[PDB]
Design a protein around this ligand. Structure first.
Ligand SMILES: Nc1nc(C[C@H]2C[C@H](O)[C@@H](COP(=O)(O)OP(=O)(O)OP(=O)(O)O)O2)c(NC=O)c(=O)[nH]1
Ligand SMILES: [Ca+2]
Ligand SMILES: [Ca+2]
Ligand code: NA
Ligand code: NA
Ligand code: NA
Ligand code: NA
Length: 322
DNA sequence: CCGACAGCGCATCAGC
DNA sequence: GCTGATGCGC
DNA sequence: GTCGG
């Protein structure tokens, strides 16, 4: 919005650092900078102004000054005209092709979707599914479709065993008008820290032809593809990414809190937890002893139990953007 | 000045 | 056959 | 690239 030109530039530099440079911490630095700028309530007018924000340092302030004076960044222009950097960058858009495989393909003259399709033999199973659904995976999911997807998953899970608990987390649980994918957290009273559960559920979703493809799957984590059924004369829906994570029941609501997010919120809640003598991670909340030693995990029967320990007013998922 | 920067489940590969 | 390292997505 | 110890 106010600073969309700047945040595009920084996101473009981030993707380059990750995909071409293979410099994951510079990618994250650029993303962190773009996220604080996108949240700033003023149209930035200088590099110096931007450097006041956390995560923006000298180099990005100089890039902002150049962008503001000229409307472009020379570094980006050279990157965009570099065929190797652009080909590597494009290929990483396939799910399962990362910076390493992208660079490898491009070294041997494999640079286009068409090249991938003629070189299907050289792709692993995840990359093959990424290629198959290349356009669909980059489409967003309207909330009304997420709602329909929730009803299918929740119902079929219930048909396998009435005592499963399944929760759709991610941006959907925070009320987003659209989501990138579907995140399902699953548990069962029979699965604890100290004790086919996932397979049964996946198989059922396949039998009703909801789940169409499998990227990866083990005893606790399923990553795959699903699609809503359409009516006879309608256009078919896009295929969608869906993950299902089976979490032990004594860690479930810590799981739910973590996978709901958002990232900033989790961070701010973990910061506050320490301040009160507790430490939270994706699995547990533990009390901190006088010297700093983490104690045993506390009992957590609900998401609100976690806020109670750290004497926090319960935040509705709708309000967990920060 | 310089090391940290999140880290885990699953797939795949190198090595034994 | 197995283990441990690494790519990958998140 | 940015931060902080
Ligand atoms: N779905 C998912 N999320 C995470 C991270 C946690 C922490 C983050 O605050 C929360 C939301 O992350 P996610 O990438 O799922 O994005 P979301 O907020 O759902 O946006 P979108 O994916 O575009 O709908 O999930 C994972 N772990 C590490 O990133 C993971 O493996 N899968
Ligand atoms: Ca998500
Ligand atoms: Ca399609
Ligand atoms: Na700054
Ligand atoms: Na990719
Ligand atoms: Na996503
Ligand atoms: Na350095």
């Amino acid at each position: 919005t106010l600073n969309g030109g700047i945040t595009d530039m920084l996101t473009e530099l981030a993707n380059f650092e990750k995909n071409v440079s293979q410099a994951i911490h510079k990618y994250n630095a650029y993303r962190k900078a773009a996220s604080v700028i996108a949240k700033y309530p003023h149209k930035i007018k200088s590099g110096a102004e931007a450097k006041k924000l956390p995560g923006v340092g000298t180099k990005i302030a100089e890039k902002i000054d150049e962008f503001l004076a000229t409307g472009k960044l020379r570094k980006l222009e050279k990157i965009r005209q570099d065929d190797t950097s652009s080909s590597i960058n494009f290929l990483t858009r396939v799910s399962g092709i990362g910076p390493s495989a992208a660079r490898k393909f491009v070294d041997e003259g494999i640079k286009t979707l068409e090249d991938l399709r003629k070189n299907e033999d050289k792709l692993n199973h995840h990359q093959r599914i990424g290629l198959k659904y290349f356009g669909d995976f980059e489409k967003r999911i309207p909330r009304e479709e997420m709602l329909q997807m929730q009803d299918i998953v929740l119902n079929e899970v219930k048909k396998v065993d009435s005592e499963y608990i399944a929760t759709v987390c991610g941006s959907f649980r925070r009320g987003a008008e659209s989501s990138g994918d579907m995140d399902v957290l699953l548990t069962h009273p029979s699965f604890t820290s100290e004790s086919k559960l996932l397979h049964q559920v996946v198989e059922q979703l396949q039998k009703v032809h909801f789940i169409t493809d499998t990227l990866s799957k083990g005893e606790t984590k399923f990553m795959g593809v699903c699609q809503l059924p359409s009516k006879n004369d309608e256009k078919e829906y896009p295929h969608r990414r869906i993950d299902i994570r089976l979490i032990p029941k004594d860690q479930y609501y810590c799981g739910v809190l973590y996978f709901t997010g958002s990232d900033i919120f989790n961070k701010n809640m973990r910061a506050h937890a320490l301040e009160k003598g507790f430490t939270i991670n994706e699995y547990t909340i533990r009390p901190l002893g006088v010297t700093g030693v983490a104690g045993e995990p506390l009992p957590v029967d609900s998401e609100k139990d976690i806020f109670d320990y750290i004497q926090w007013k319960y935040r509705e998922p709708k309000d967990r953007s920060e």
